[PDB]
Design an enzyme around this catalytic site. Structure first.
Site, mmCIF file in Angstrom:
data_model
loop_
_atom_site.group_PDB
_atom_site.id
_atom_site.type_symbol
_atom_site.label_atom_id
_atom_site.label_comp_id
_atom_site.label_asym_id
_atom_site.label_seq_id
_atom_site.Cartn_x
_atom_site.Cartn_y
_atom_site.Cartn_z
ATOM 1 N N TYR B 155 0.372 -1.018 -0.658
ATOM 2 C CA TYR B 155 -0.183 0.029 -0.259
ATOM 3 C C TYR B 155 0.947 1.691 -0.024
ATOM 4 O O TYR B 155 0.693 2.115 -1.121
ATOM 5 C CB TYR B 155 -1.221 -0.175 0.974
ATOM 6 C CG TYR B 155 -1.913 0.862 1.603
ATOM 7 C CD1 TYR B 155 -2.354 1.474 0.798
ATOM 8 C CD2 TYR B 155 -1.652 2.302 2.416
ATOM 9 C CE1 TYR B 155 -3.639 2.821 1.020
ATOM 10 C CE2 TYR B 155 -1.809 3.422 2.815
ATOM 11 C CZ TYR B 155 -2.735 3.671 2.018
ATOM 12 O OH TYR B 155 -3.398 4.921 2.238
ATOM 13 N N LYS B 159 1.246 4.417 -2.908
ATOM 14 C CA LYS B 159 0.997 5.543 -2.691
ATOM 15 C C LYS B 159 1.704 6.883 -3.230
ATOM 16 O O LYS B 159 2.079 8.030 -3.690
ATOM 17 C CB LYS B 159 0.455 5.704 -0.857
ATOM 18 C CG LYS B 159 -0.797 5.096 -0.948
ATOM 19 C CD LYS B 159 -1.630 5.754 -1.662
ATOM 20 C CE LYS B 159 -2.519 4.878 -2.404
ATOM 21 N NZ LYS B 159 -4.333 6.147 -3.225
#
Lengths: 213, 226, 227, 214
Positions: B155, B159
């Site tokens: 994740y 990002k």
């Protein structure tokens, strides 16, 4: 003698920077495992390295291929034992295309060669690496600024590689250090990489070390 | 009045943040198109809340990792309302917490596809339909800067990618279009919520941000638990 | 042997980090000049330890916020050893933890002068005496990136200033001279390296392997003072 | 109505960006204090435009490197309008382009005092007279990030310091007071960003640098 009796895997060691890294580690006493997909550059280097009194292994590997990465890592571990260093040099622009020119397959080709490959090599190497070991990745100024005309997919993957490097640092330390070089000749780059993979940098992890070259 | 007669596409209203953005824009007069995937109960709330303002949202089911469903949603939006003034891409998420040893390659791609590839598809598809001076707003994360928390490595990586993609896309598509990111933190189990993130998104899509592009705008608080 | 016949000026050996750097460069063959101010008991240790290696440091008293004492220290060094190959500027520090309401203007300038103005002075003075391919290493800090801890706002500010000074100076003095900064964290009082390890990073940045690094800030965990 | 019955001090408001800020704030209902140290034309022009809108303004001559003048300027703001809701420190400047061999100690100090010491003085002075929920807005610059262009070493350094100072102060004075930087398309555009950061729209934004091409 920074890498005396140490085993370093250079992933993407066929040309230029990876090649120069492979030799520099040997010059410092390491057994060096070279991977390539693309063989002259790597063979040469193997010979150069043997000429130095040192040990080396060249292995064909598509670094986007989970299986060939397993096969490559396993050979390295089986031949030399514990891995002290992984240097993941593989990556590349592939080509310049605006977003209107990129199709989904091209996007994935760039992200896979620069980013997925690193996930695979780091994942596979880690359970084999020596306590005190180290990973060195390659980021880029394009990762910081968004890159130049047509290089959107490559810039994106390098920014990812920078974040991944910091995240992995926290996840696998204190046992394993993880740092990026952000690239002067190939052998200048290799001096910096060897520093980061050495115990000279025992307290450096999660960082990006820039070099003009 | 900020968005009177502007068409705003909110991609990822399968998430709570898209619920918040979709309602915010409609409260400000926009023509809202919102895509959704999953249980999409947050999307259903946005739709019923929007009807209560007397206008109506165009809500479209689309898995934004599917290039065909991305093209359908964009076409239907263009059909209904004309020029797209705003695309807000909020799809993504943590999916699960797993160390690199626990992750398999299909887990890696699921996270990267939902957070990053979806962004590529939707920006790529929306761009030809966008108005002069239209804005894209992307979703990054303080995790993108610092590598994220335990088990969040895939994740965080996505990002960071979104942050860089935003700077690149901005140089490529300006001066006609602006591209910017919001960079929230997380909610711990002074922090703002999705309602406050929605406020910053609205700002970046407004006329007051006409000359902001290729930027990551920080905000404390966020859309998920740390 | 990394610094054999290299002349290295450690400006700020009034601080523990300057003790650590001075001894380290001497261990690696350098001609070491170190300046000091305050009780300087660390500088006195460096001198005694260097003598035990069979060479001799030039130790010079200088308040690095005083332009005249900076000029003298620099001349004395050029006079003794010739061209300066390495300027390592480590002067600075927190001075005291004070909120903005507790700081007065004179306190503000004291922190900014010892950390920043001293760097301007010693880099300005040293530059004309430096060798082709010479290196400057400055001392920044993670607090320069994130704004620092409670009461440390003047210190942190000076450390971000140092980081930006390092980038601008590198563009202005290259390709003849490199300029880079180390960026340590802090020692908690509750893997942190110490001044001995920061010294190792400084040595690297001053070395031949860092010939193509300039304008960069190099992080290392652990550090020279308590958080 | 974002600044209805709020008092904003714009430090350095005689030209370009500060003048545009002072005006923008008035347009949204603010009482506005303007400091200037130059010719007083631009700041009085502005005071006039602001009264045209039916809002109160006050121009004050102040050398923001002077602790006494800053204290008097803040003090006059307070007497006239009461609690300060926003400090916008626009004062700063290149002064001139000089390589390090060309700078003397007095020039170095002059650049750091105009860009950096002034901000220390204006923030230190205003803070104890700020309203709960108030906000500071400072001016960083891309030179602070990359070290600047030829001759701009001293200016760039002061800007990097302003950025760090912004982050450090934000932690020190929050939650009561927010502190953020704009990193600067015209002066009015810049002012719209400034106004956002100074408003309750940015209630959850503090310690940040917001970029604008302007």
């Amino acid at each position: 003698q920074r890498f005396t009796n140490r085993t370093i895997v250079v992933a993407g060691a066929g040309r230029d920077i990876g090649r120069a890294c492979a030799i520099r580690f040997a010059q410092e006493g390491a057994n060096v495992v070279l991977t390539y997909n693309g063989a002259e550059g790597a063979a040469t280097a193997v010979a150069e390295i043997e000429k130095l009194g040192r040990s080396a292994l060249a292995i064909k590997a598509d670094l986007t291929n989970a299986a060939e990465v397993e096969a490559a890592i396993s050979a390295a571990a089986d031949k030399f034992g514990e891995i002290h260093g992984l240097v993941h040099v593989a990556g590349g622009l592939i080509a310049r295309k605006t977003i209107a020119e990129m199709d989904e397959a091209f996007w994935h080709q760039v992200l896979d060669v620069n980013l997925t490959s690193l996930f695979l090599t780091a994942k596979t190497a880690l359970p084999k690496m020596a306590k005190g070991g180290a990973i060195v990745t390659f980021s880029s100024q394009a990762g910081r600024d968004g890159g130049g005309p047509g290089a959107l997919a490559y810039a994106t993957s390098k920014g990812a590689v920078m974040t991944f490097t910091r995240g992995l640092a926290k996840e696998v330390g204190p046992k394993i250090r993880v740092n990026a070089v952000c690239p002067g000749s190939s052998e200048d780059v290799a001096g910096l990489v060897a520093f980061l993979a050495s115990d000279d940098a025992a307290y450096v992890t999660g960082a990006c070390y820039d070099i003009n070259g």
